[PDB]
């Protein structure tokens, strides 16, 4: 079970460094609002085709 | 706390995989049901043909239809048996997911308790240094 | 609707919540410690004590 | 951590209250199945709340000890300063005695 | 408000206090020794005796 | 409205904190003058005492 032991140690160290840089409130908020609006338009087009 | 953090990330991805597995099981049950439904519909159609054959007076056609119906019934029976076995397995999978949901919440609560004792131990070490 | 891990809305809410929770918790704990200290505690009393005597003095001052 | 658990506990209580209202609404509606489902959800929520409460109690005892240690430490640092003055005087006296020997 | 170690106000007060305390203590001790000496003690009396 | 009320309370607390800080800085300015005077007297006294 050496691989499993190795994986846990490696994953924890890697995850912590990545999350701190990643976790910024201003950057995350701006990206999310733009993405959802774009998604809705794509969904509407698919729905329109079905309606058509 | 680091071990707990490592475990929390790991548990979330695993749940998604389980959901996909559950969907396949759900899909399989639906697929069998669709086949079963088709067989029932086919059997009903076959019965009508047999009834029509009787009116027609052709005994041989009716006999052939009956044999086909029997074969269809056997297939339907096999499908039904498979569904029952599948359902028990499916229920367990569904139950496991529910249990897992309760467990992840418990783990979060556990992390807070685990963190406090560790912090207290660290505080004790500081006193020794003094 | 289900809320996939990769979905933008789900990810944004989680990230925002973590940052918000940490900031709020840290500020409150620090604030409580300041409140806990004795210097802050009788300072308010001193202010309260100071105004009432002044008010009595003020009435005397405004009397004529 | 204690605050986080409390917030989660508070959210659960709020959710439970909302769930209870929905169950009450379901009874008025006459849909028995919806009410039954809500009850199951409430039970699950209650279990989570119970777990959170248990965690908080364990955490509180640990937290109290940590708080107590800090208070003890504050008393100790002041004592150490007092100790330094006493320690310094005896050492100085010993040095003075050594000077006499040299004479 | 709490007074962090790195805070300028907290650091300034501690540094100022140490310098002030040492200077005040040293001057007083030296002054006491001068006062303690016998020459200073009857000199005041002589001045007092002389004026009357 | 709920968000506004919570935010308003926090804002009020911040304003109160600022007032406390203002009192503290003013006191510090007065202290420097007092500290310097004390230091000068001690330095002059020490040189005189040694002689």
Author numbering:
A (entry chain B): 1 to 52
B (entry chain A): 26 to 155
C (entry chain DD): 156 to 219
D (entry chain H): 53 to 155
E (entry chain B): 156 to 207
F (entry chain I): 105 to 155
Copy text from the publication:
Reconstructions were also generated for the other six symmetries and complete ring models built. Rungs are maximally constricted at the top and bottom with internal lumen diameters of 14 nm and 15.7 nm, and widest at the ring equator between rungs 3 and 4 with an internal diameter of 17.5 nm. This unique asymmetric curvature is a feature of all Vipp1C11–C17 ring symmetries. The analysis of different ring symmetries, ranging from C11–C17, provides us with a view of the structural flexibility that enables Vipp1, PspA, and ESCRT-III family members to perform their functions. Furthermore, as each ring comprises between 5–7 rungs stacked together to build a dome-shaped architecture, these asymmetric structures provide us with a glimpse of the structural features that enable filament tilt in the context of an ESCRT-III-like polymer. Consistent with this, Interfaces 1 and 3 linking the top two rungs were poorly resolved in Vipp1C11–C17 rings, indicating a weak interaction once the limiting geometry is reached. When membrane was modeled into the Vipp1C11–C17 structures as a 4-nm bilayer, sequential constriction was observed with the membrane lumen reaching ∼3 nm within Vipp1C11.
